[PDB]
Amino acid sequence: TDDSHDWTKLRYMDNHMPADAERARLFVRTSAPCTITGTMGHFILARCPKGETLTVGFTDGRKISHSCTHPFHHDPPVIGREKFHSRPQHGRELPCSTYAQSTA
Amino acid sequence: NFNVYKAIRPYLAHCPDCGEGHSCHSPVALERIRNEATDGTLKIQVSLQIGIKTDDSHDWTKLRYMDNHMPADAERARLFVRTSAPCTITGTMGHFILARCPKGETLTVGFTDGRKISHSCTHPFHHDPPVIGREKFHSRPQHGRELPCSTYAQSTAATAEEIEVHMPPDTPDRTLMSQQSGNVKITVNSQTVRYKCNCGDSNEGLTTTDKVINNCKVDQCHAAVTNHKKWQYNSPLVPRNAELGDRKGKVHIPFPLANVTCRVPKARNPTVTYGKNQVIMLLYPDHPTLLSYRNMGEEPNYQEEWVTHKKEIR
Amino acid sequence: PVMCLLANTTFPCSQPPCTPCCYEKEPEETLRMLEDNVMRPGYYQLLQASLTCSPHRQRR
Amino acid sequence: EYKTVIPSPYVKCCGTAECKDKSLPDYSCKVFTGVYPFMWGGAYCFCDTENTQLSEAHVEKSESCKTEFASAYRAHTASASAKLRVLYQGNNVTVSAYANGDHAVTVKDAKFIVGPMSSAWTPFDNKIVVYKGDVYNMDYPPFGAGRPGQFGDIQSRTPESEDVYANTQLVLQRPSAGTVHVPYSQAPSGFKYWL
Amino acid sequence: EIVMTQSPATLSLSPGERATLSCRASQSVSSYLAWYQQKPGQAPRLLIYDASNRATGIPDRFSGSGSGTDFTLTISRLEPEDFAVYYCQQYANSRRTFGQGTKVEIKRTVAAPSVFIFPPSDEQLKSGTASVVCLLNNFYPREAKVQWKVDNALQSGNSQESVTEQDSKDSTYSLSSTLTLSKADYEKHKVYACEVTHQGLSSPVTKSFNRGE
Amino acid sequence: EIVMTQSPATLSLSPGERATLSCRASQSVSSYLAWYQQKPGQAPRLLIYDASNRATGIPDRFSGSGSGTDFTLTISRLEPEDFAVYYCQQYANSRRTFGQGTKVEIKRTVAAPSVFIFPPSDEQLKSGTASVVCLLNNFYPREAKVQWKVDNALQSGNSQESVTEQDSKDSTYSLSSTLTLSKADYEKHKVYACEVTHQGLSSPVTKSFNRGE
Amino acid sequence: QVQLVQSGAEVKKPGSAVKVSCKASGGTLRKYAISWLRQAPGQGLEWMGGIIPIFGTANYAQKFQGRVTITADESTTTPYTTTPYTSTAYIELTSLRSEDTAVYYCARDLGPLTGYSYSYFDYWGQGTLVTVSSASTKGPSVFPLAPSSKSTSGGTAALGCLVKDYFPEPVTVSWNSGALTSGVHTFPAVLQSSGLYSLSSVVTVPSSSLGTQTYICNVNHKPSNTKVDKKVEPKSCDKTHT
Amino acid sequence: QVQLVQSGAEVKKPGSAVKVSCKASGGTLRKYAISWLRQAPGQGLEWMGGIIPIFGTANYAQKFQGRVTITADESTTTPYTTTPYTSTAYIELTSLRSEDTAVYYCARDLGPLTGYSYSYFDYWGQGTLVTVSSASTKGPSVFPLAPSSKSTSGGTAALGCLVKDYFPEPVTVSWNSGALTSGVHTFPAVLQSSGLYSLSSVVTVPSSSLGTQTYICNVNHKPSNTKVDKKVEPKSCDKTHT
Amino acid sequence: QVQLVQSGAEVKKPGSAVKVSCKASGGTLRKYAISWLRQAPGQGLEWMGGIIPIFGTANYA
């Protein structure tokens, strides 16, 4: 809320005033908890299991918990010719696309 | 019981997915998921050692993990294994975890180290336990009957099944070497080290103490911690020390497979009513249930079907 | 009895090659038997004495 | 169920590893060339190429085969036995006997002889398999005849014998770039599928 | 602000003694401290993280203690390699802050300073210049005061001070000071006679010299 | 390692006073403490866990306090069943350490014991052995010393002794001492007069005996 | 509630070994640890070690590892016990010295159940004495505590017995076959420098009662089965009985 | 274990700018922060800021905003990577003031990995020195220090050397080309109130050997690769020498 | 932000009854409790009791 970058905090709206909480208690969850892979400003990247809804939430400095829950059909497209569930040790490489980690 | 963990120590190994789709070398690398217990228990082998607090002392409150060049400690409290959703852990000893899991297409195991860093390893693994009896069911029922099955028993004082250890290979480390003044210092830090070069010098060698090698840049040199007092499992994820290996003597492994009964539900009575030379039955399955029938004569004819919702059969 | 192999020397399989505190004295020497006694029936007697029976002190 | 045993792979820096033979039940071995594995701290090899990796594997009975196993039997003719209740003058009494038409059993000074029955039918066919309570008529493959990925892809003459027959069609494969693992390909356990 | 403090600015003791260094913060940091040792001609190295956990490969001698606002680092029995600068550091908020630092010093029996003085030479005198030196040599403890006292008067407006530490073999400090002016100003006096006040001496000491010989 | 301590190594309080048993740890413990009592001639029992939570069977007289290096046990009123040994136990570390024991005692007005002396019997002296005995009845408090003064010679060190705990009668203490003697020693000595000596008693108390008669 | 019970109490020669056993029974919880704790004859109280008796995993303090074996017996392997749960533990102490003498307790530990925390001990058994000493069983010398002219009539007095150079402490003793109780003392025990025991016993009385009233001492020893019920009349060099 | 390596030390005119480069390698961990700290010689130790080399996401202690920028270089590292891991980071110090003269450290910060919180500085670079002044690269005044009017034997007397009037501080000195080792104290530095440095070197002796021994000293400096050698015998208003 | 409003002051005989009341509005949070406290000018400040108005479920000193 003093307009510093910080990486340990986030800021949210408390009635008429901006206020602060830890990035440590941000979460996102489809059908089960997602990994969060990068965050900046209004934008979050996440890796999420198959599910028909997405939720995002955090815990306030007051220890109040907030969350929000849209319908969203998450079902990643298959790459190549096998409907595999998690990356193997041994396999081939195929071309695909990803949101890069950079905030530039 | 089993103080052989005096000689044998944890290690890092290559792991395919560390929670973000990256591979890396991980202290929690999975070796093998055993899967013979028909009650659906898993026995998991992993690169940690659980139940020893370093200083080779058995202590159920801790585990030790390989931290770069030496072991270090963390709590048994924060270890987890997870499939599609969190699993229960029913026993823990040495390199081995027993767990009971919900059905799912991947397995991951992880823990938090003393610095509050968290590590995990993930494998593709089709966990789907085979059905005991004639009904699929999801939790053991309040009333039912007992059938024979098989389970990893929880006794750690085990027998007959065995594992092997070796003198672990040279550990390469680019940070044994530092470059300054147009020379390379090899810093050694009380280890036993090997070094090699082509830098306008040919004179490679072992050392047990720090020195310079002169007139060179560190990329014209290579080094490793070369000799060990403590052993590792001969995992296919670590390189062998020699063409015929070494120290090939055994160690016993916990949690022996044993036959035991478990409880299965009994589907509720069908409502039946009799027709002209036939039976009419409603069925009331709470979960997918097998029906079968045969003639009590010189041909059985025989048919069966799984049923998943109320039906009428004639 | 039955007899262990050390390198050229032999000893009874219940007995130590070296004592007290076999491994705690000399790890890279305690390697010598555990290289090759892997095929022998005495290995778990030798291992108990060397590494587990009574934490290198008194009695089981 | 079989297990596959895969020792730590040997990597020769700066030269070929020699390949060698071994007699084990389904043994397979290869040498791969032009490897350059990295461990966590650095490249393991002293030079950028001309390294090689030896890799080797074989199948064995699992630790579980004391308990999780099935038995292939031929079944020959059968020792008929019977249990009978009889009532006379308020004496309600039970007798147990073989059906051989002799072996007279006396009780309460009465004496009883039974069988043989006129039928010589039996449900068991000439070949059977048993697992636990379950027993099956099936024409299982003869010893040493079993194919990969089907019942009998691994066989032993007795549960305790070391003379493992196995036919799993195990094949080793090229280790992936920069990585110390041992990849392979193999028919999954024909027993686990049969269950 | 979270204001840090280390109570001993210096700690002097002999090898085999318990070192114990102590830290304060103006409000609770509640763990989130760390301890470092720092060596001359090096960057710091970590000893302790959180209140009490030893850093990677730090042997046994060091231990950390405390909570809230008050903390300490203890060394079980100080080895001859451990004599160094030592720092606390806070990480309870975005202004990560180090303490003032503390020096840990070999305690030894007393030795008092010897005084020396030196004239200018021909290369300065041809260059319009005169330069004069005052020394204190090889003493412990080191808390001396010195002045140039030329014709008894304070000379300072041209004159600097410098120090050297405990020598690794001898365990003594020394001082060097210079007076420098135009060669024509250096002739304004006849008694160049620097003083010393010290704790191992019984009374202040002085030694005297004259320009033109 | 961690070490445990209390301020009162023993605690003299009359029934109906309030207890405040007080504890130190030599290192930064942080909760993970317990309090126990042991009745004389019985097994211990748990009173308090973590730091302040009381066990299920335990009366609301007890409460805990403190968090870090320091802890206390309060008993809201001492009761006749609550007079016991008390212990801390620490479990922030693998070295699960009990805190020494400390005894709560009924505080009372002081009183000198009556002293008796006894020779060895004719049975004892025909059996080739001897021991003269000193008996103190109903002392309050209990920190006194005894000596034998045989043939006017001061002696005490070669004596074997025991004491009895606070009396069910009136909370006094009773004491026994015996002198190491061979048969000849009791016959060689002519006069016996063993004495009690203390800080809280106003003078020595003694009874005297010309041998055998 | 849960009850802890351990078998017997013992006295043994140096260099021998001892095997204590314990039952835990009636608790609602299951995976709890059993720990062994030991108390000296007046010195401190120590954790030795413990086990989780389903796994058979054992933990020790560094002083007791390789002196001691802690172990347990498999209670039931089937996924049942709707019956009351029980678990059985054993401890062996080996190569005994006199200074290993103590009372030993089994105790229940919640450490594993409470998220693999370090222990705090919840229930204790009654304790067992393990005694290490060279002395064999010996019956007492049973002397009267001889009175003399050391005060004479009219004063306060006591009459007594001195019990000497026996072994084990159960020389359980009383007055007038139970008819006397007020003004008595019997002391705890004295460990003799010879590795034997002695004991003092008295009844306080008016000095006029000695050598005319009847007072009797009941020396009963559990070892050697002695029952020296006798009166303790004045005899120091003089002679007297009522 | 792990190491950090950074740019060589540098000297600059005030009102210019300078960039310090850091590289880190060889640790097992992937996504730590790299952070910059600075220290005016022994006067303090200040955390300035940092980056996470994966995200950029530059972060600053408020005291340095406007006077510094921080950056890091992303690389063609694949999702698998399969090497020892590496990172590259910078501080660009800008609008330089002479008070910026300090040693600057790079250090590894575990804050992101430790649950997105603050952390201690886990591993450190060598440190590197920034010098800010307007001065020209003057080579020293190198005159011999003259021993005073001699106090004579029965004790110890003055002997030494002086070096003055240089920029770039890294001079070196050596008596009798290293044949004298013990008894030498060299006073490390002085600042002459206007950018120039000074040094003195001294040899405490018994009064035996003035005007007699070949006491001689080397002086070495980096500007113009200047190097010097001189004797230290008494010469002022008159002379007495070997 | 938020405000609480409550009924105007009361004056009463001993042995009578009072129905004091209040309203809350404008908060983003839905499930807060409402609590009642008092002070006499000759006393400190004390919590009496409260409710979560969605459930009822009163709680008291």
PDB file of C-alpha atoms in Angstrom, chain B residues 131-274:
ATOM      1  CA  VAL B 131     -12.080 -55.470  -6.128  1.00  0.00           C
ATOM      2  CA  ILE B 132     -12.280 -57.938  -3.205  1.00  0.00           C
ATOM      3  CA  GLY B 133     -15.454 -60.056  -3.565  1.00  0.00           C
ATOM      4  CA  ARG B 134     -18.516 -59.230  -5.732  1.00  0.00           C
ATOM      5  CA  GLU B 135     -19.298 -55.548  -5.014  1.00  0.00           C
ATOM      6  CA  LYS B 136     -17.188 -52.408  -5.665  1.00  0.00           C
ATOM      7  CA  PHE B 137     -17.117 -50.309  -2.446  1.00  0.00           C
ATOM      8  CA  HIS B 138     -15.397 -47.131  -1.244  1.00  0.00           C
ATOM      9  CA  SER B 139     -15.121 -47.434   2.572  1.00  0.00           C
ATOM     10  CA  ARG B 140     -15.408 -50.542   4.784  1.00  0.00           C
ATOM     11  CA  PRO B 141     -19.016 -51.006   5.964  1.00  0.00           C
ATOM     12  CA  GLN B 142     -20.536 -51.076   9.470  1.00  0.00           C
ATOM     13  CA  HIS B 143     -21.928 -54.614   8.778  1.00  0.00           C
ATOM     14  CA  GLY B 144     -20.940 -57.249   6.199  1.00  0.00           C
ATOM     15  CA  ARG B 145     -18.811 -60.404   6.059  1.00  0.00           C
ATOM     16  CA  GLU B 146     -15.101 -61.218   6.169  1.00  0.00           C
ATOM     17  CA  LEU B 147     -13.085 -62.404   3.109  1.00  0.00           C
ATOM     18  CA  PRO B 148      -9.378 -63.371   2.700  1.00  0.00           C
ATOM     19  CA  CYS B 149      -6.976 -60.788   1.208  1.00  0.00           C
ATOM     20  CA  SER B 150      -3.305 -59.649   1.598  1.00  0.00           C
ATOM     21  CA  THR B 151      -1.603 -56.660   3.244  1.00  0.00           C
ATOM     22  CA  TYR B 152       1.847 -55.296   4.066  1.00  0.00           C
ATOM     23  CA  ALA B 153       2.063 -56.070   7.799  1.00  0.00           C
ATOM     24  CA  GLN B 154       3.377 -53.170   9.931  1.00  0.00           C
ATOM     25  CA  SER B 155       6.227 -54.998  11.789  1.00  0.00           C
ATOM     26  CA  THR B 156       9.621 -53.372  11.015  1.00  0.00           C
ATOM     27  CA  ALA B 157      11.608 -56.375  12.429  1.00  0.00           C
ATOM     28  CA  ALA B 158      11.441 -57.888   8.924  1.00  0.00           C
ATOM     29  CA  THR B 159      12.933 -60.930   7.194  1.00  0.00           C
ATOM     30  CA  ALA B 160      13.701 -62.709   3.880  1.00  0.00           C
ATOM     31  CA  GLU B 161      13.217 -59.731   1.462  1.00  0.00           C
ATOM     32  CA  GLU B 162      16.443 -57.789   0.892  1.00  0.00           C
ATOM     33  CA  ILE B 163      18.157 -54.779  -0.793  1.00  0.00           C
ATOM     34  CA  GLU B 164      21.812 -54.020  -1.764  1.00  0.00           C
ATOM     35  CA  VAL B 165      24.250 -51.094  -1.273  1.00  0.00           C
ATOM     36  CA  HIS B 166      27.478 -49.958  -3.004  1.00  0.00           C
ATOM     37  CA  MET B 167      30.402 -47.561  -2.452  1.00  0.00           C
ATOM     38  CA  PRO B 168      28.626 -44.547  -4.028  1.00  0.00           C
ATOM     39  CA  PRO B 169      30.198 -42.950  -7.154  1.00  0.00           C
ATOM     40  CA  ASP B 170      32.312 -39.781  -7.301  1.00  0.00           C
ATOM     41  CA  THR B 171      30.019 -36.734  -6.857  1.00  0.00           C
ATOM     42  CA  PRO B 172      30.931 -34.081  -9.489  1.00  0.00           C
ATOM     43  CA  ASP B 173      30.747 -30.488  -8.192  1.00  0.00           C
ATOM     44  CA  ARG B 174      31.817 -27.407 -10.209  1.00  0.00           C
ATOM     45  CA  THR B 175      32.052 -25.439  -6.906  1.00  0.00           C
ATOM     46  CA  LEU B 176      34.940 -27.481  -5.469  1.00  0.00           C
ATOM     47  CA  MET B 177      36.933 -25.213  -7.867  1.00  0.00           C
ATOM     48  CA  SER B 178      37.258 -21.380  -7.790  1.00  0.00           C
ATOM     49  CA  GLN B 179      39.157 -19.239 -10.351  1.00  0.00           C
ATOM     50  CA  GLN B 180      41.378 -16.281  -9.319  1.00  0.00           C
ATOM     51  CA  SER B 181      44.791 -14.687 -10.231  1.00  0.00           C
ATOM     52  CA  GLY B 182      44.915 -16.737 -13.512  1.00  0.00           C
ATOM     53  CA  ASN B 183      44.900 -19.971 -11.399  1.00  0.00           C
ATOM     54  CA  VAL B 184      42.293 -22.442  -9.995  1.00  0.00           C
ATOM     55  CA  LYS B 185      42.045 -23.104  -6.254  1.00  0.00           C
ATOM     56  CA  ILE B 186      40.547 -26.480  -5.387  1.00  0.00           C
ATOM     57  CA  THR B 187      38.947 -25.794  -1.970  1.00  0.00           C
ATOM     58  CA  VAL B 188      38.224 -29.426  -0.835  1.00  0.00           C
ATOM     59  CA  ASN B 189      36.470 -28.510   2.511  1.00  0.00           C
ATOM     60  CA  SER B 190      37.813 -31.631   4.366  1.00  0.00           C
ATOM     61  CA  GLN B 191      36.430 -34.057   1.705  1.00  0.00           C
ATOM     62  CA  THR B 192      38.484 -36.516  -0.415  1.00  0.00           C
ATOM     63  CA  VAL B 193      38.603 -34.976  -3.926  1.00  0.00           C
ATOM     64  CA  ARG B 194      39.668 -35.930  -7.459  1.00  0.00           C
ATOM     65  CA  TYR B 195      40.542 -33.361 -10.106  1.00  0.00           C
ATOM     66  CA  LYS B 196      41.441 -33.443 -13.825  1.00  0.00           C
ATOM     67  CA  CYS B 197      42.535 -30.846 -16.430  1.00  0.00           C
ATOM     68  CA  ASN B 198      43.811 -30.046 -19.946  1.00  0.00           C
ATOM     69  CA  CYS B 199      44.549 -26.358 -19.199  1.00  0.00           C
ATOM     70  CA  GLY B 200      48.160 -26.233 -20.464  1.00  0.00           C
ATOM     71  CA  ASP B 201      48.781 -28.673 -17.565  1.00  0.00           C
ATOM     72  CA  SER B 202      48.219 -32.478 -17.755  1.00  0.00           C
ATOM     73  CA  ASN B 203      48.805 -33.178 -14.013  1.00  0.00           C
ATOM     74  CA  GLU B 204      45.430 -34.466 -12.716  1.00  0.00           C
ATOM     75  CA  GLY B 205      45.111 -36.281  -9.356  1.00  0.00           C
ATOM     76  CA  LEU B 206      43.495 -37.221  -6.067  1.00  0.00           C
ATOM     77  CA  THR B 207      43.834 -34.878  -3.052  1.00  0.00           C
ATOM     78  CA  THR B 208      42.790 -34.809   0.650  1.00  0.00           C
ATOM     79  CA  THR B 209      43.715 -31.061   1.060  1.00  0.00           C
ATOM     80  CA  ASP B 210      43.289 -27.750  -0.803  1.00  0.00           C
ATOM     81  CA  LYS B 211      45.830 -26.426  -3.367  1.00  0.00           C
ATOM     82  CA  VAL B 212      46.163 -24.292  -6.505  1.00  0.00           C
ATOM     83  CA  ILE B 213      46.697 -25.538 -10.028  1.00  0.00           C
ATOM     84  CA  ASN B 214      48.272 -22.722 -12.026  1.00  0.00           C
ATOM     85  CA  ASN B 215      47.938 -20.826 -15.349  1.00  0.00           C
ATOM     86  CA  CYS B 216      44.319 -21.912 -16.086  1.00  0.00           C
ATOM     87  CA  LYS B 217      40.572 -21.141 -16.246  1.00  0.00           C
ATOM     88  CA  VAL B 218      38.161 -23.416 -14.323  1.00  0.00           C
ATOM     89  CA  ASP B 219      36.295 -24.687 -17.454  1.00  0.00           C
ATOM     90  CA  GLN B 220      39.667 -26.253 -18.499  1.00  0.00           C
ATOM     91  CA  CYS B 221      39.371 -28.382 -15.295  1.00  0.00           C
ATOM     92  CA  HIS B 222      36.937 -30.905 -13.643  1.00  0.00           C
ATOM     93  CA  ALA B 223      36.512 -32.142 -10.030  1.00  0.00           C
ATOM     94  CA  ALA B 224      34.469 -34.485  -7.789  1.00  0.00           C
ATOM     95  CA  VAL B 225      34.262 -35.723  -4.176  1.00  0.00           C
ATOM     96  CA  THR B 226      35.890 -39.065  -5.030  1.00  0.00           C
ATOM     97  CA  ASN B 227      35.793 -41.384  -1.997  1.00  0.00           C
ATOM     98  CA  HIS B 228      33.087 -42.286   0.546  1.00  0.00           C
ATOM     99  CA  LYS B 229      32.836 -43.994   3.963  1.00  0.00           C
ATOM    100  CA  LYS B 230      29.006 -44.475   3.788  1.00  0.00           C
ATOM    101  CA  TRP B 231      26.932 -46.530   1.308  1.00  0.00           C
ATOM    102  CA  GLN B 232      23.873 -45.951  -1.001  1.00  0.00           C
ATOM    103  CA  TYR B 233      21.249 -48.256  -2.551  1.00  0.00           C
ATOM    104  CA  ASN B 234      22.305 -49.368  -6.074  1.00  0.00           C
ATOM    105  CA  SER B 235      19.424 -47.444  -7.727  1.00  0.00           C
ATOM    106  CA  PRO B 236      19.246 -47.356 -11.560  1.00  0.00           C
ATOM    107  CA  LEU B 237      19.179 -43.532 -11.091  1.00  0.00           C
ATOM    108  CA  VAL B 238      22.863 -43.286  -9.884  1.00  0.00           C
ATOM    109  CA  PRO B 239      26.013 -44.285 -11.859  1.00  0.00           C
ATOM    110  CA  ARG B 240      27.935 -47.442 -10.772  1.00  0.00           C
ATOM    111  CA  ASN B 241      31.444 -46.933  -9.316  1.00  0.00           C
ATOM    112  CA  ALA B 242      33.201 -49.724 -11.336  1.00  0.00           C
ATOM    113  CA  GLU B 243      32.522 -52.243 -14.163  1.00  0.00           C
ATOM    114  CA  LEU B 244      31.720 -55.019 -11.564  1.00  0.00           C
ATOM    115  CA  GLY B 245      30.481 -52.749  -8.704  1.00  0.00           C
ATOM    116  CA  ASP B 246      31.521 -53.071  -5.017  1.00  0.00           C
ATOM    117  CA  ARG B 247      30.295 -53.676  -1.375  1.00  0.00           C
ATOM    118  CA  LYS B 248      27.494 -55.877  -2.875  1.00  0.00           C
ATOM    119  CA  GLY B 249      26.363 -57.296   0.545  1.00  0.00           C
ATOM    120  CA  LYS B 250      22.671 -56.972   1.538  1.00  0.00           C
ATOM    121  CA  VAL B 251      20.331 -55.163   4.002  1.00  0.00           C
ATOM    122  CA  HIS B 252      16.765 -56.301   5.004  1.00  0.00           C
ATOM    123  CA  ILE B 253      13.649 -54.250   4.068  1.00  0.00           C
ATOM    124  CA  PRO B 254      10.597 -53.634   6.313  1.00  0.00           C
ATOM    125  CA  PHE B 255       6.862 -54.452   6.091  1.00  0.00           C
ATOM    126  CA  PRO B 256       6.493 -58.107   4.960  1.00  0.00           C
ATOM    127  CA  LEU B 257       3.475 -59.164   2.857  1.00  0.00           C
ATOM    128  CA  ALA B 258       1.018 -61.295   4.919  1.00  0.00           C
ATOM    129  CA  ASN B 259      -2.411 -62.940   4.434  1.00  0.00           C
ATOM    130  CA  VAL B 260      -5.293 -61.368   6.460  1.00  0.00           C
ATOM    131  CA  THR B 261      -9.133 -61.141   6.346  1.00  0.00           C
ATOM    132  CA  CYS B 262     -10.991 -57.886   5.547  1.00  0.00           C
ATOM    133  CA  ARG B 263     -14.709 -56.882   5.573  1.00  0.00           C
ATOM    134  CA  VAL B 264     -16.928 -56.482   2.484  1.00  0.00           C
ATOM    135  CA  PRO B 265     -20.526 -55.160   2.356  1.00  0.00           C
ATOM    136  CA  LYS B 266     -23.532 -57.358   1.557  1.00  0.00           C
ATOM    137  CA  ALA B 267     -26.038 -55.878  -0.915  1.00  0.00           C
ATOM    138  CA  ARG B 268     -29.546 -55.491   0.577  1.00  0.00           C
ATOM    139  CA  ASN B 269     -32.226 -58.096  -0.097  1.00  0.00           C
ATOM    140  CA  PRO B 270     -33.895 -57.949  -3.537  1.00  0.00           C
ATOM    141  CA  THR B 271     -37.690 -57.664  -3.548  1.00  0.00           C
ATOM    142  CA  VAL B 272     -38.817 -60.830  -5.341  1.00  0.00           C
ATOM    143  CA  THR B 273     -42.210 -62.031  -6.594  1.00  0.00           C
ATOM    144  CA  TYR B 274     -43.070 -65.239  -8.432  1.00  0.00           C
TER     145      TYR B 274
END
